[PDB]
Structure 1
Amino acid sequence: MEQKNVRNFCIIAHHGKSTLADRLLEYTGAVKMQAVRMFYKAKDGNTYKLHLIDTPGHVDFSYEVSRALAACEGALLLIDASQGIEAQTVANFWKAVEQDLVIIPVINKIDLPSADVDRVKKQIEEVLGLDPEEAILASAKEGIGIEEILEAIVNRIPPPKGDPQKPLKALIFDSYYDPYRGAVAFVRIFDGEVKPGDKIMLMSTGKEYEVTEVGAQTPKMTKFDKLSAGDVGYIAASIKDVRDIRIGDTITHAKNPTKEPVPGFQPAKPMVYAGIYPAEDTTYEELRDALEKYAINDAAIVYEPESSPALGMGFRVGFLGLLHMEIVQERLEREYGVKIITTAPNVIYRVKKKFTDEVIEVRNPMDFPDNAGLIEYVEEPFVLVTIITPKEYVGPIIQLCQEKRGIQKNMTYLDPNTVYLEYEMPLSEIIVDFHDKIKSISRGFASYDYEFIGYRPSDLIKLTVLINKKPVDALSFIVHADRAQKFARRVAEKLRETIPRQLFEVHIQVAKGGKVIASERIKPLR
């Protein structure tokens, strides 16, 4: 098995990604699935070593998607025959292009009555600028497209380039914690070779380890004698935790190190925070214990203890985004059976106060200065939002983005009935209810994606929530001055419905620097 007969690819799709991977394995052969090695004898008679790299889909894991892409030579771009191209589809397309990958468009679900292949092919040509003729048609239920897919991989994706004799240079594109093998890194070997007993080094840290095991999923985790230039597999080396083998980092040899690391390394970057407190019977200790265990399998999550006068003790947890938050929540409740209450999420604000030289990073609203007079300026993160929707919903969506302080930067037609929109919007407005709103007004037909584009100064203020003339720190939030009144009313009306009834009247107030701007009351229990 030579390196010229190796094919490194990944599947990119929101649109039946997992299914395809299964069909691919069954056809060839018959811990999360990753770095799968398959053997395939093509029509040309030769047998090929194929490596399938699993990639995440959501924008929250954008950096991780890019690192996985940088480990491949090609990608199967899955597009649903009915939906056609979506915002994620376009975003992922460009990231693949960005990593010089050969893109193989795969239109699946061709069987559905709603399917419209000709339309999708048209989009592939006009929007992606690819050859509609090179698109592959697939259908799980009918069982077609696999051989054609495998053949396209062999014939269209170039083999890996790298020298097995040069110093080791392996890119880490994923990882997980193994209770027996320790923290395991899923890697792509560009140069050199690695084998058990080797003394390796992590280039971003300079930390060294002794390899204990190497291999790949076949689909079971199988140990190999080594991994060489072009290979995709895993490496174990008595590594204490997944934060020591950060995605995007380069693994080389301690004594004979490669010249430069793979470019593009970036540490995990939390973007959305929320307070998490124990609920029902769950105690603080149990929540903390749960977070510690979970964290062992999540290299991106951060958290620290915090307290509220009403909620008690909890944690200010930082996530990569809303899905990541959702994933953590469900796993804490499911895996560890803990009951938790989560505050409204918030972004990281940068505040410049009068008597403090350095700008302060606020990840907890209650840490935002109470004294507005002391604030010289506040900046918040903005993102570029791309949206794809049927023409019928364009107006309602535009109005929505506009209400959320969005600035339109572009509008284009992806076909006579499909519109593409680009909007610069504050991330703070996006994490409130944008997702459910855009989905309801589009009947689930509109899609969107976004990219961080930097911080910008804004007229932001802190609002406090008082329950019975006395405030509750955990409910304080940051809002744009112009949206204050509206957010205040919404938050108040929400609490009037949220909290139950008591023997006494429950007065809810939302104050802006001392003055009340929203009031709501819950009459006595009766």
Structure 2
Amino acid sequence: MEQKNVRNFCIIAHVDHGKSTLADRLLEYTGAVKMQAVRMFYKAKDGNTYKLHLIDTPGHVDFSYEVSRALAACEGALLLIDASQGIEAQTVANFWKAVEQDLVIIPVINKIDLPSADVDRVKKQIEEVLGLDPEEAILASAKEGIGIEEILEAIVNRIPPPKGDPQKPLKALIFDSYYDPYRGAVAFVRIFDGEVKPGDKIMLMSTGKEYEVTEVGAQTPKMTKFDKLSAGDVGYIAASIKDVRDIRIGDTITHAKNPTKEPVPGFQPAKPMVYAGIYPAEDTTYEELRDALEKYAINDAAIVYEPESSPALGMGFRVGFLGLLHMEIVQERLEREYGVKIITTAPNVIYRVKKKFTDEVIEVRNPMDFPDNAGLIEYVEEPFVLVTIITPKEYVGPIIQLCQEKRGIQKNMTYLDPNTVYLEYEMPLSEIIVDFHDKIKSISRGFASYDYEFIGYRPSDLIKLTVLINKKPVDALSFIVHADRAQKFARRVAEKLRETIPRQLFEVHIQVAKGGKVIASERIKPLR
């Protein structure tokens, strides 16, 4: 059909508000490998039938880049808000990302069936915090198909149709991908200009690598191959591509022979932020761990890893993740998809270290590599992030105190309503990736939410602490901490480790040292 009858949208909501539930009602309503680039047909009330494309988006800050790329592939977005919850951290962050991509935003208040639902409140938040017309808000219940058709109409009537020329040089944005054992590395794309069909020879603009398309199509919801994809469409492309790192998200696919003038803007290679050592546990061996990682990696273009060994732990891997959730996902899937037993060290951020006789600043991804000789260090910088927090006013005080305990600098504070506070803090990421999520959760009864974004590196007074077990240091336990927090971390780690190690005939003396100086000791008496 015509592009004027096409609608490209996505759903963006704080986790738990009903994104998945709603995608089903939408598909179910219209109807009669992960879910992505879903094509639907909808006969509107105006009589015309429209071709709708549901682009699934990540929900965690760890996948922020990927989220932006998915938004760049749509013309609009459904901003799903839980009527019993109201606006939360991810709600605001995602809203602005959508705003930045110039998307028509359709707010939908979900769970209006719940006894705790308060649509009037949420409407007030939408207008005051988001600056949207509460009137545009679509009340709904994805749990009870209430408001589905109303959504589909808003999408047809509110979201503009794609604007592109199928006669112009191909220009397709890669917003997602996965590895198909049979089709190879598969790219989920948005076609801006031109058309693409099996047999065509494409080219990846960031690499200049060329391939020959083997198949094109979309999920309906099953992976259906079409004979082509044209400007405005959303689907997938296969072309005998070795792996997902060849079709990086945010990249542009054009024709090898007649390439488009410029690629879609905003391309960025994956950037690991948090690292950790993963070591084989129980009976699992190194090989089984290595083999499992190689297999998992095939379906994950962001993860990086390299062989690492420690005195006590033996051989493992130093793995880099996009964040904490990404690490968790990898952990669970490694033990659940390949059933390997692993112990994971405390995570760490990448530090920039300038040492006296080395011209170039060194990037430290493994604490073990942080210079032991503190005298040789000219300076060290660490990544900082801007943290946004939304909480009921009753907990603002405890949260504020938690944030400053963790070296946070308050930059702003506002009320989203008479009982809801909004906060912004600049914090070292190293402080955020250690017990911040739970602390913030327990003190707010799980009511406070937060989000954050990298704002760059800043020099800080950090130092390396080493752990000694019976006068013998285990490098895998050394860590970097701010000089002012050292004593506390030392105590925490010492007291934590004692209860982390079982008894034995010999007394186990645990020591946390600072450059040869023990600043925390803990001992677990012999085996009874």
The answer to whether TM tops 0.5 is yes
Is the CA contact 2:416–2:422 (under 8 Å) kept in the aligned structure 1? yes
Structure 1 residue 142, shift from structure 2 partner: 3.0
SS in 1 for 2:484: helix
One of 299, 303, 306 as aligned partner of 2:305: 303
Task: Show structure 1 runs of 4+ deviating over 3 A.
Answer: none
Secondary structure, aligned partner of 1:432: coil
Shift of 1:249: 0.1
Query: How many Å apart are 1:13 and its aligned residue?
Result: 1.1
1:220 to partner: Cα distance: 0.4
Distance in 2, Cα, partners of 1:213 & 1:145: 37
For residue 233 of structure 1, what is the aligned residue in structure 2? 235
Tell me the distance in 1 between the aligned counterparts of 2:445 and 2:492: 24
Distance 2:301 2:313 in 1: 28
Q: Distance in 1 between matches of 2:145 and 2:279?
A: 48
Secondary structure of the residue that 2:155 maps to in structure 1? helix
Structure 2, unaligned runs of 5 or more: none
Question: How much has 1:30 moved relative to structure 2?
Answer: 2.1
Q: What SS does the corresponding residue of 1:489 show, helix, strand or coil? A: helix
> Residue by residue, what CA displacement relative to the aligned partner does 1:85-105 show, whole Å, maximum 9, x if unpaired?
001000000000000000000
1:140 and 1:430 map into 2 onto residues whose CA distance is: 34
Q: Secondary structure at the match of 2:473?
A: coil
1:185-226 CA distances to partner (integer Å, 9 max, x unpaired)? 000000000000000000000000000000000000000010
Query: In 1, distance between residues paired with 2:143 and 2:321?
Result: 37
Q: Give, in whole Å, the separation in 1 of the partners of 2:338 and 2:227.
A: 37
Distance 2:108 2:453 in 1: 25
**Which residue in 1 is equivalent to 2:443?**
441
CA distance in 1 between partners of 2:62 and 2:108 (Å): 24
Q: CA deviation at 1:430?
A: 0.1
Alpha-carbon distance in structure 2 between the residues aligned to 1:29 and 1:91: 32
Asked if the contact 2:170/2:254 (under 8 Å) is kept, the reply is yes
The separation in 1 between residues aligned to 2:227 and 2:368, in whole angstroms, is 55
User: Aligned partners of 1:32, 1:327: CA distance in 2, in Å?
Assistant: 15
State the Cα distance separating 1:11 from its structure 2 match: 0.3
**CA–CA distance in structure 1, aligned partners of residues 322 and 238 of structure 2:** 26
Residue aligned with 2:379, SS: strand
CA deviation profile, 1:151-172 (whole Å, cap 9, x unmatched): 0000000000000000000000
Post-superposition CA distance 1:217-276 (Å, at most 9, x none): 000000001000000000000000000000000000000000000000000000000000
Give the SS at the match of 1:463.
strand
Shift of 1:143: 2.3
2:107 corresponds in structure 1 to 105
Alpha-carbon distance, 1:374 to partner: 0.1
Deviates more, 1:290-299 or 1:140-149: 140-149
Contact 2:21/2:143, CA 8 A, preserved across alignment = no
CA distance in 1, matches of 2:427, 2:447: 21
State the distance in 2 between where 1:143 and 1:461 align. 56
Give aligned pairs, total.
Answer: 526
* Equivalent residue number for residue 8 of structure 2: 8
User: What is the CA deviation profile of residues 340-399 of structure 1, one whole-angstrom value per residue up to 9, with x for unaligned ones?
Assistant: 000000000000000000000000000000000000000000000000000000000000
Moved more, 479-488 or 7-16: 7-16
Secondary structure at 1:141's aligned position in 2?
helix
Match of 2:333 in 1: 331
Task: Check the 8 A contact 2:142/2:148 in 1, yes or no.
Answer: no
CA distance in 1, matches of 2:243, 2:498: 45
The farther-off stretch of 135-144 and 176-185 is 135-144
Q: What displacement does 1:16 show?
A: 1.2
| Distance in 1, Cα, partners of 2:18 & 2:133 | 22
CA distance in 1, matches of 2:302, 2:21: 27
Aligned to 1:23: 25
Alpha-carbon distance in 1 for matches of 2:438, 2:421:
20
Could you tell me the TM-score, scaled by structure 2's length?
0.99
User: 2: distance between equivalents of 1:194 and 1:188?
Assistant: 11
Give a deviation string over 1:36-89, Cα, whole Å, max 9, x none: 000001000000000000000100000000000000000000000011000100
CA distance in 2, matches of 1:17, 1:130: 20
Distance 1:134 1:63 in 2: 28
> How far does residue 140 in structure 1 lie from its aligned partner after superposition?
2.7
CA contact (8 A) 2:292 2:338 kept: yes
Listed one character per residue, the Cα deviations across residues 464-519 of structure 1 (whole Å, up to 9, x for unaligned) are: 00000110000000000000000000000001111000101000000000000000
**Whole-Å separation in 2 of the counterparts to 1:165 and 1:501:** 73
CA contact (8 A) 2:276 2:346 kept: yes
**TM superposition shift of 1:141:** 3.2
Task: Indicate the SS of the match to 1:449.
Answer: strand
What is the alpha-carbon distance in structure 2 between the residues aligned to residue 441 and residue 498 of structure 1?
A: 25
Q: Please state how far the C-alpha of 1:328 moved relative to its aligned partner.
A: 0.1
Structure 1 Cα separation of the partners of residues 49 and 90 of structure 2: 34
CA contact (8 A) 2:471 2:509 kept: yes
CA contact (8 A) 2:18 2:142 kept: no
Residues 475-494 of structure 1 mapped to structure 2, 5 A cutoff: 475-494=477-496
* 1:305-320 to 2 correspondences below 5 Å: 305-320=307-322
Query: 2-side partners of 1:200 and 1:139: how far apart?
Result: 43
Task: Check the 8 A contact 2:171/2:192 in 1, yes or no.
Answer: yes
**Map 1:235-384 → 2, pairs under 5 A:** 235-384=237-386
Q: Does the 8 Å contact 2:353/2:361 carry over to 1?
A: yes
Scaled by the length of structure 1, the TM-score of the pair is 1.00
Aligned residue number for residue 45 of structure 2: 43
